[model samples]
Target chain A: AGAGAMYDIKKWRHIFKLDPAKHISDDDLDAICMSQTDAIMIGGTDDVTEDNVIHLMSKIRRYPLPLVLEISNIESVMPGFDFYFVPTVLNSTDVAFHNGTLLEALKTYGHSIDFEEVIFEGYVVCNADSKVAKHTKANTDLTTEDLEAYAQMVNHMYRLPVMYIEYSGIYGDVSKVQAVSEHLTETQLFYGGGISSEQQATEMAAIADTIIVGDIIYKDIKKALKTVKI
Target chain B: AGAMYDIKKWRHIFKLDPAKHISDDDLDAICMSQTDAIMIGVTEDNVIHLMSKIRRYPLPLVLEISNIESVMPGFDFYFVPTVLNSTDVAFHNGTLLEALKTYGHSIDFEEVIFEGYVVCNADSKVAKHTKANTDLTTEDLEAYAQMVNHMYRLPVMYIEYSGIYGDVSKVQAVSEHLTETQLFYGGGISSEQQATEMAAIADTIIVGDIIYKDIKKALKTVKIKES
Candidate 1:
């Protein structure tokens, strides 16, 4: 696959992040096969290591879907995977979250990182209560224009490969997603948080290049397959 | 003097730090100091107002940038201050990164300093909310300084004592391991003995609160800045 091949992923791609720190078992991955998820994203917000990345990547090597590693620190990069998503929050008040963490991540592990294999996912974390929201000091009180302007900058100004509107624990406004989606003509747009129903997924699928569902499915796995089934 | 950065260059920062209740006379006295740098604390909303008052004189401005997005960016040098021992990542690398993304490439600043802070005062807000470690063993403070240097790749690491002072062993840990990065120790230098003891280990020391309490004592700390 070309390094940027994932960006040209024309159709909708649903990604299931398997966080080992979440205590997700190998057996839990079977549910992923049953769901409509197109790829497996591996990372955790915290408590991630090279061992954690290796153990999870090894277990699911036999699985059908593509494995995408969303790396948090330098230690989490392993050789086998062809693709990676590095989260860089654009509107974050903290230096580390906005760019420092990724800058260090690249400096320390750039040799291991293939440009094609890496995806710089710019984020506007709007959820007030999420750990990431607090960590980044995200501006939760953005107007529609402000939010849309952020999305525009992420795509055009920064020329980032990806833009993620992360609501995390809370469900975000679909209109804001629509506003962001309007400006992201070229960038691959991904949306995650508060998605529990097929209705929610289908609605988001209309605008986003990818729709991500995490905690809701973790809470009730049986309903996850049903929720993602388009 | 512009090229000369010595012990006198180690400033007595009058941090308009929101956490501390600084008085008017102290601010006036600090502004009038013949030998100190004024450390202004400002958010985007009030930065213009604050900068307007301090612009004409053009003293050495070491901006303690609280909000990067709001900072208008015309300072002599910038202090990318970080709490090295903060349990929260916000203090460690977040503030610097946020500023970097906004103005990292754009600004050709005079100099940039990476502050490896350890707020030791039990009563200050930097201690309570920032979760600055007060109980760090001498060994732990050294390790944290090394970690900050390894992670950030910067030249300066300031181990701030903030509101209180304890053991000199903390300063010793940094002096031993730090080879290339300069070690700056701050806080609780109210006397000549305290200043000399810290100066023996730290490359530079920043003195604050002790100045406002007694200008005579403050002058003593200033003398220590060059000691």
Candidate 2:
């Protein structure tokens, strides 16, 4: 989960987000259960309290995959977790992702179990938006050049095993992703945020290591998983 | 009405509020048609463009008879035999009745108007509050003297009327009448802050009327502050 793996993009195509609200309903889980997903990242943010992770993960129903608790509370060190991947609040460059939620989680559950510690190492799509992101004070709406430079800087500085190149919505150019790709030494890319159609995901999957289809799955889950076909 | 002459509690009440919202209501003209009185005093912190005398007799509201007599704006021309009133030397007293008695012993006021002042009864009542008795008795002065004696010991120079408001819990409502003329206020003020705030807009913050009416309510409205 550190700087030790070059996990392939093809392996990450079936990455399903158990956002725990409406997206991962019992019906929807059964629907995507047969998609042959490469990974199932769990643990969640608010429901990530120690008690829920430890005592209430069975209500997560059943899945045929190795469900990993991404970054739940320390008390979440229960029998529910198959792996662990912490999504740190890696907004500011002043602190490395390891010093954030990852460090907090590691401090709490480091010796408790042999759970694999990983990160959903990706860039945020805070477009200075008027949504809930507004309250977070995250108005980071970078231009093509700005995003590319930031990506290169963080990958080299953190020495992250992989760095994601999130698309937000601008999906016309492969050259933009190529700009950051050329700068980094060994960081990989994970693109999400506004991969609308199957063709766009297929097109982006060509250059980026992985393309996470978030809103697309909401619109058409059956046809949405086919986005991995390309 | 920027200024009002309270028929009761004889004082000029100034309304610092402008006519941007009021004049459109035709409120001033309606009051005149209903009541029978003449407004004489002229108090305009704001600039009024027109109107001289004649507008006084037709107006139903008037305050500060002494001030009005001193500067009889439009009344002389309006009343056929204008009964010029005396207000200035009287209404300014903290206890309007005390001021009336100390100076008002000989004066015969047939239609003795209670202008802009809270009418509070200082004696007999457990607390002085604004409630009119129609007759001004001597007992009100007992409470008034107690208050005056107390205030005299304090640094009244630094203390404004509002500061005194805090001590005289016996005062009640500051009343006033409205007109396109002078405005005033009276009764129930507390602390120097209240005095400065009211003094900023009102020609006066009258306390006498409420003292004459009910002292306890007056005390509630105005609190005492040592500093």
Candidate 3:
């Protein structure tokens, strides 16, 4: 497994996702770094630039936690991160989100890429109102059965490393997330959405292999820290 | 205590917004469901049209009058909502006062019901249209519940979430303050578990959006009251 063998993401209980496009205070960043969260994933929906990603990476580099860069665009791609996550929106109505970007990235930097350090995420954007859903033109009005099929595809067909059930800004139905988790055999389920409270964090942590806390860090860092599970 | 008194015992009420569409088959399935009553509301022009279709069923049919133009004579009970949290006075009493001026002489006080509505969801249409002050805390909701239950002695204190799932803790806080005024909870109740959770705390759970989205799932909500 090489670089992939060095990190076991399946055992990770909680992750903090910091947006490169957003601002965070030094004290807040310090709290997040020391919050006992398993990993720090740096990504965003819009305005992601190479400068901001580098700036964020520099700040997070001081911490001992495993750092990951979720590549949204080819221009933002750089070095020094422990792992690089490439997302392919499986439920996207547009082919661009599904394979267009991936093909372009491969054509540009396929030779430079270290396969062991990269993980492909099978993304299923669930929030219709989210910017990612709009950008990808994802079909978000999914039933439980639709979610199960996506889970199967990620686990069996594609053999993807991660199955991300992304609601983005709003809290999704727990039962639906649970249904998706049950169908997965090898792919680790990553649930992320409107997790502002400890109760919501606990609820999602119980069902998902790894829970991602994002928006709450900008709103209330104290509440975001509480999302970490022991 | 007149015709409005019997509604206090209702555990589940299916809300049909006239602004939306419902097929004959879906409507029939809803009418035949174990839901206690059918509350028709949300638009002026289509109110009578929806009423005409719903009147065929033997179930209790109530019209929630949003405007004076929608007022008709066929409904078994007429629910007049006064948005308690509205920043605009028009939504509070201006519409009601105008309705009184026009039909005070012909009004049947026995059939008319007043619901003190606390619109909670900021993203909902009702909150936006009425200019409702939706940034309310649990204590704010408790105070409003106390006012409706004690100060005004209104028949219904409606906690309207409309499209989003509200905080259960806030709903529970409101339920603690209510005594006589029936606690009516309406929001993102798409599953039977959601229906049952709200039904436990609220005197009446109003199932609205789910009926239009999935009738089979909506029908399952009615069974929560039976359990």
Candidate 4:
């Protein structure tokens, strides 16, 4: 199968960010991955290493689902994966995560990696205590104006194709999603975290181009399927 | 000249990031240099562990804060660092609002002051993910100093270069606006002349990247003796 056939990332309306470290039962993984999500995002804040992600993809490939890789650094790049979310935290505590890593990747491997297969995702890792938020060291208490400015900056200045508002640990402020969405036009906005129900996913889908869910499926696969199917 | 600390006593502030892995010998050199105080990241979760490591430092410690609720209790002084020019409201007013609601009445106001930071580099951590104005005119910087000092009445106003240098007159403009508030300058200062020129304007100067780059040259800024 060609890389394009695995998942039409833009065509789908939702992606499930499954943490590589989370212990989801095989029965649960099959049910959730096969039926619930359009694509499975296989990564985490800490353990989303090259070896771990490959191992994870090996395990998840058993199901008839598309796999997408979300990465933090340049070292994590591997072969066979055509689609990549080379995410930059628009407001990271380390400059490396904001633009350094992205620029470094382009400078070194610009010729090897197909930019067409890449989506430069600008992440706003809000939700103060979430592992991703802590890993990125992002500020969660952004005002409405702040959120809009961030969206504008990333979409216009950085010229990224996707904007991800990941709540990580908890469900985030809907107003934040709304404010950021208002500023972006051509950029694909992906909202994740705290989406456990059809209602949450549906509401988020209304504002964002794609609604992502992770934690909900870990507990109840049947209940989580509602987010995609409903 | 400033109420927080006598500007006469200290001219430079150095950030000691645990992640950077500064050797004990280098740390001792910093303690011996003209650097006034060391700044460290503090949160409610890591406060206990961090305090255990830094409590015995020779210079005064300034805790750069995010969530005040997470702060370890019973600290002598703190720098409630705020990115006044941040696109994110949380760095500007959100953290402060949360601090006031949780720790306002119970804590001593004198021990804390708002550190208004103008992050001027796209590569800085403070400038990341948020809308930070990297290219400000001397007039625009002065306006920020006025807003934070007079409008917000934040006790301290800081400008972070994050390993890059801009117009020195921007520092002068910000210095011109302060009355009771202290002024701080940081980032891109690797030489004695740069430090001395900055010290002439800001009441306090902070050096970080240089500590890892050229600690000896960076420490020369600390040698600008009180006249």
Candidate 5:
């Protein structure tokens, strides 16, 4: 059919491309897709590529939710999911990472969709001081001002719901988080960095919209479960 | 800052305004808007309004794959599931129902889901051909669908992965074999004329996308099913 048909039903995301290395199976990834964690973003970097990315996206249909391809700055994958968002991270001062993956996807699968445009695009804030941040300290030590500026960028330009930083797997950045929240309630705020403790989660929830945690569960899900409200 | 935001990370549903009855459940109705199905086919009139509304803006409808709405327009419970998408349904999401049995959390069954079409027997490998699909047999599959029903708290399954005419033999199977009471059926069905005939046999019949695709054809069969 037309590209708009594909776009209307698709969802592209910035997934943590660490599954194959972690030996994640079709079934495990399937369960993750079903669990309500926003969207299935296949964040591919040097560790992952579009070839394997297509295979992984093919396996993400266990949940009715769509698979969003978080395209890389290098080259986008073939066709997958219902929407596209060339994701970039803001570490306070500047756009930490902004790839033209969406532009590349439009060149490819843009015709498989219906709207022929972006749907459900999100500007996620990921920091390294959090689990992923600590894990991939490839950031520029962005402060709350930096994060707020990025949130405003997302608000002014893209105009979708995204006000929170997916603070890696880190849990709480109380002061920095509140500043971002106050700035972008227009975009649903997301805070997820080093946030595994229930008290810490409760503290962060004190002012945030949602606190997400992953990877940490790869070790102790019990401790992970106890930390979140359910 | 209200009940909607109280739960830190709760999933919600929208678009559940099918009947005047649900209007009384305004708050509960709104709670469903937490970002899920918009169950709008409660009765025949409700289904009619739903058809008109969907024409204007196709809201994300949480269907039950039943032919009930087409059969009983005014019937109070038209909101069921369009459970199966393809004949060999792989479920809506990418995860297999088998996965949840082992790895996922042991939390509230708020939205814990299954991946197969609602089967007459829980095994779900096969579809039932009777009116009372709830009339299941004492089989391993029946037991499994039952367990997931309770565990997931979505006790009522909206199965439409079937086109078997619910006959006397099927009704007997339900009375003698299964325990799942709530069920829905759809597919190749499109109107209330064909619906009035299924009154004693099914709780609801789903008819919409088929109807919306062609209301004339949908109305041709919107009668109660007698067989």
Candidate 6:
């Protein structure tokens, strides 16, 4: 199958991210899977093991919605997902986040893997205090110009499919997101961070191509389901 | 004896960062250049030693106090910076408060000047060390410039890029808003063209890294002030 021919995430408005390390009730999981949301992305910053991922994937596989595995570590990577989103931290000072881990993964699984299901995401980590920021050594002290440059780099220079503006825990400046959104032409802009309420989801959904709601799903299933744009 | 020197008339200044090394021949050439003043600043490693050597020249020497331990008595002026964009209060008033507490009585109040420093470059050492909120827009920098010019009424509003060359439009935007404050621009000035470009917009341009890199090219920067 050709890439993006099966499932097109460009038209997607909302996504729910589920952390493998955290536990979710079957009732809540069923509600999320059955919701009007676009997809369920299985990913986490830390403590994400193969067992936990397999356990979560097995549960989420019951649903008809598209499944995504955002590969944070090679050990947690397994088959049976609709898409594999591999993120490269664009603003990271460390080489590992940019190419070291990806190089290792490619070296190990390059020959056997299906290229069509794999999507490369250029992640620009914004929250300075977020765990992903510290883990990737991301330089988060970015100006509007800096972000615009990164957006240009992602959209025009590198021509990556997805440019994800990740705030991780806290709500980010909507103006900055809008500024980044304006610079992108072909690339899909994905905004994720502190999106719990319907209003917050609506606010981000207007500018970003796709709004990712994570923490709220584990907190309140009702509010998380409310994030879905009908 | 007082800090009443007209820095407004000063179009160019040579910043001698103590963190980097410079030869005596290069130092001699810099002092002889048509620059207005020599500002000794950045990280302190041979500051006193560098100051003593610089003091031998006839040019006006100024010390930008970055470290409390490096503070000495022989400079013509003392510029104490309070980082306006720093996330922590420590970078704003913490260092100044500590300096005042230590040398309150013996300090020459006339010679010491406070500068409202807005660090721009995110990759610079000072920006990282101070934890400056480098995520500023042009409007945000204009607000800082207004705050420095009107609210605080500081003598100098130093737009420090530290090691990288900054956007001229943003600096120009900040410059257009200021009236009372003397706008000082610094970072990545090595050639006469760059010095002249910054000097045309800013009240004063500071040249640093080039002096250590290429004294010949650095000497050309001083001519920008004369032009």
lDDT by residue (tens digit), candidate 5, B13-109: 2223244333323323233322222444336565665544443432234432233223332221223232322222222111122222222223222
User: B128 in model 5: Cα distance from truth in Å?
Assistant: 73
Clashing pairs in 3: none
In terms of lDDT, model 2 sits at 0.39
Which lDDT tens digits does candidate 2 get at residues B80-138? 11110111212222133233324333333333332223233234221122222313223
Model 2 C-alpha lDDT per residue in residues A111-229, reported as the tens digit of each score: 35332234445344434432323322332554555555446433532334446553343443467666666655655666655665568767777777666555555567776677667
TM-score of each: 0.51, 0.41, 0.50, 0.49, 0.38, 0.51
What TM-scores does chain A show, candidate by candidate in order? 0.91, 0.72, 0.95, 0.89, 0.64, 0.96
lDDT of 1 by residue, B31-80 (tens): 66654566665344454545455554445666766556445566666666
Docking quality (DockQ) for each candidate: 0.03, 0.00, 0.01, 0.02, 0.01, 0.01
CAPRI tier for the interface of model 4? incorrect
Q: Could you list the iRMS of every candidate?
A: 9.8, 38.3, 28.1, 16.2, 21.3, 22.3
Score candidate 4 by DockQ: 0.02
Q: Whole-model Cα lDDT per candidate?
A: 0.65, 0.39, 0.80, 0.68, 0.41, 0.80
What digit string (tens of lDDT, one per residue) describes model 6 on residues A34-57? 989989999898888999999999
Q: Give the higher-TM-score candidate: 1 or 3.
A: 1
Place model 6 in a CAPRI quality band. incorrect
Per-model clash counts, in order, read: 8, 66, 0, 6, 111, 0
**Chain A of model 2, TM-score against the native?**
0.72
**Candidates in descending lDDT order:** 3, 6, 4, 1, 5, 2
Best of the candidates, DockQ:
1
Candidate 4: stretches off by over 4 Å: A1-7, A103-111, B1-227
Provide the RMSD of all predictions against the true structure, rounded to 1 decimal.
10.1, 28.3, 21.9, 16.8, 19.8, 16.6
Q: Is candidate 5 or 6 superior in TM-score?
A: 6
